[PDB]
């Protein structure tokens, strides 16, 4: 999907910037493991500098400001403008669980190009407030997407697999690595996915340094080539051996207590093997997590 053109790596999807690693929700199987993270809000100046370096060799269709809950950031509009100023993307998208959206000001609605709201059963957003948000979106020329989630899929385990065939299959079918292109910027490094950077240091055994799976963003004389090779590499990451990619077992969406939130079951027992077969045939196969989706795009 990713191509090299006019001196830059072109991602048809988005570059992901996590405004906040923490969240106000405790969803089971959170892909960013946000329930395990204390407050950590990205610095707009640092993000601007890092993305400015990356943007000389990289362009994406959109920048996705997300994380745990980006509306927890003390100055999300400043972050939005820091990202926009680099020109690394065509548009800027914010993804939120919506629980704090009633506090967003006119500044927020004027700052974003697109808004993605996840609506979860335990924090249901009333349909009249969704309608309020759709009206606000149309008024400010913001493309709106509202996903009503019924299920989540398992994402990781502390007890990883030593079976290379299974890790190969999980990597090959991973939507984050190959279809969604969830390129993630964190602390000056670029990653193929949020799992490879956010899950290793949250293993209670201590894990490992996630930078082994990353690429340092720098003014290297060959940075374009290094970037292209990193983003088109076809070998499983170290983190793959503790991850379920896109084929983890389905479960009803629910929040868990913080105590005991981490997953210890052996990774092989958490694979949805029929779905792994299906995704081996078609990596775009719907994961069955979104029950329904509302889209109100801006067009013309
Ligand atoms: C880290 S979240 C974006 C941030 C924001 N706090 C939110 O979710 O509303 C990334 C997206 O992937 C979805 N997601 C996270 N974990 C998932 C899982 N284990 N299975 C399926 N979808 C998941 C979430 O619904 C979310 O829309
Ligand atoms: S909302 Fe649920 S999924 Fe999205 S970040 Fe917070 S916890 Fe993880
Ligand atoms: S770690 Fe390996 S499997 Fe898990 S998401 Fe990143 S690439 Fe896909
Ligand atoms: Cl996700
Ligand atoms: Cl392990
Ligand atoms: Cl390298
Ligand atoms: Cl467990």
């Amino acid at each position: 999907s990713v191509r090299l053109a006019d001196g830059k790596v072109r991602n048809p999807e988005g570059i992901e910037v996590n405004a906040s690693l923490q969240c106000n929700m405790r969803c089971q199987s959170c892909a960013h493991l946000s329930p395990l993270y204390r407050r950590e809000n990205a610095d707009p100046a640092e993000i601007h500098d890092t993305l400015s370096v990356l943007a000389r060799s990289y362009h994406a269709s959109y920048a996705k400001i997300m994380g745990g809950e980006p509306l927890l950031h003390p100055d999300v509009v400043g972050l939005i403008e820091a990202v926009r100023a680099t020109g690394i993307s065509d548009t800027v998208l914010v993804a939120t669980n919506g629980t704090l959206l009633h506090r967003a000001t006119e500044r927020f609605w004027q700052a974003v190009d697109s808004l993605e709201i996840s609506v979860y059963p335990s924090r249901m957003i009333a349909p009249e407030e969704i309608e309020r948000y759709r009206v606000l979106a149309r008024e400010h020329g913001v493309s709106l997407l509202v996903n009503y989630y019924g299920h989540f899929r398992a994402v990781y385990s502390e007890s990883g697999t030593d079976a290379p065939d299974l890790v190969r299959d999980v990597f090959d079918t991973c939507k984050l690595a190959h279809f969604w292109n969830s390129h993630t910027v964190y602390d000056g490094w670029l990653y193929r996915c949020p799992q490879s950077v956010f899950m290793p240091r949250q293993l209670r055994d201590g894990g490992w340094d996630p930078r082994v799976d990353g690429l340092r963003i720098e003014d290297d004389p060959a940075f374009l080539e290094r970037l292209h090779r990193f983003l088109t590499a076809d070998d499983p990451l170290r983190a793959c051996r503790n991850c379920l990619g896109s084929v983890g077992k389905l479960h009803p969406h629910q929040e868990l207590p913080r105590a005991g939130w981490q997953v210890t079951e052996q990774l092989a027992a958490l694979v949805d093997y029929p779905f792994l077969k299906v995704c081996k045939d078609d990596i775009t196969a719907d994961d069955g997590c979104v029950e329904r989706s509302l889209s109100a795009p801006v067009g013309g």
Side-chain angles (χ1 to χ4, degrees):
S1 236
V2 165
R3 63 193 312 261
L4 207 157
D6 197 338
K8 291 190 184 166
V9 171
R10 317 277 179 178
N11 177 11
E13 289 302 324
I15 182 72
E16 301 201 355
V17 174
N18 298 279
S20 310
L21 304 191
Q22 79 280 9
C23 180
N24 58 345
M25 292 188 71
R26 287 176 273 96
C27 292
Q28 187 188 341
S29 320
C30 159
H32 292 221
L33 285 78
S34 306
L36 303 187
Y37 276 98
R38 298 205 74 200
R39 175 175 302 166
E40 177 171 324
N41 299 307
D43 177 55
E46 287 178 20
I47 294 295
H48 176 272
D49 302 339
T50 300
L51 291 197
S52 280
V53 170
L54 176 58
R56 264 168 274 129
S57 319
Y58 181 99
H59 193 81
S61 170
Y62 54 90
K64 187 177 183 165
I65 287 150
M66 54 180 308
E69 185 35 62
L71 296 189
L72 296 168
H73 196 283
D75 180 24
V76 69
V77 175
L79 181 60
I80 286 159
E81 301 300 336
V83 169
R84 172 172 290 118
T86 71
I88 197 167
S89 59
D90 297 335
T91 62
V92 175
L93 157 72
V94 171
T96 183
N97 66 31
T99 62
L100 306 177
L101 195 51
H102 66 277
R103 302 190 54 260
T105 67
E106 200 70 10
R107 295 293 104 207
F108 177 86
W109 287 98
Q110 288 175 16
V112 302
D113 300 309
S114 298
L115 181 63
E116 166 178 335
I117 304 169
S118 295
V119 180
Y120 300 109
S122 59
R123 316 269 176 118
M124 179 65 45
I125 303 169
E128 72 258 29
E129 228 194 306
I130 298 292
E131 180 67 15
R132 160 207 206 185
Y133 292 150
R134 182 175 81 85
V135 172
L136 278 178
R138 180 199 353 129
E139 276 169 18
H140 294 94
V142 176
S143 294
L144 179 63
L145 177 68
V146 181
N147 290 321
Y148 292 83
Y149 283 87
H151 300 76
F152 265 10
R153 296 191 171 257
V155 289
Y156 93 109
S157 182
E158 309 196 304
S159 3
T161 184
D162 59 333
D165 291 348
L166 173 68
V167 178
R168 180 88 233 171
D169 285 351
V170 165
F171 174 77
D172 287 337
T173 56
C174 169
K175 291 177 171 73
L176 300 101
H178 305 302
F179 170 44
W180 296 340
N181 294 341
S182 316
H183 306 156
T184 299
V185 174
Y186 184 72
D187 201 20
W189 289 64
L190 182 67
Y191 298 87
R192 296 294 297 268
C193 65
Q195 285 92 330
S196 56
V197 61
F198 293 127
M199 166 276 272
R201 293 301 199 186
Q202 290 285 359
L203 305 179
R204 288 139 150 192
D205 76 346
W208 57 89
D209 183 357
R211 292 158 145 60
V212 66
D213 290 336
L215 173 79
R216 191 157 155 88
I217 297 162
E218 40 197 19
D219 289 318
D220 179 276
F223 183 72
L224 175 65
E225 306 307 325
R226 295 188 65 182
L227 176 61
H228 175 108
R229 181 234 94 79
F230 173 79
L231 297 172
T232 62
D234 208 28
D235 295 300
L237 319 167
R238 171 65 184 84
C240 300
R241 286 130 52 177
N242 290 79
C243 200
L244 290 304
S246 304
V247 299
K249 252 188 169 68
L250 211 55
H251 64 76
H253 182 278
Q254 76 188 253
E255 301 179 68
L256 299 175
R258 169 56 176 92
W261 188 98
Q262 301 95 339
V263 175
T264 53
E265 322 184 8
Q266 153 64 224
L267 201 79
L270 305 172
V271 177
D272 185 335
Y273 289 95
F275 193 52
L276 171 62
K277 149 189 63 75
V278 167
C279 290
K280 272 200 197 185
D281 283 334
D282 165 36
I283 198 163
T284 79
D286 178 274
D287 62 15
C289 291
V290 176
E291 268 324 289
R292 51 182 193 161
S293 186
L294 316 184
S295 178
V298 303

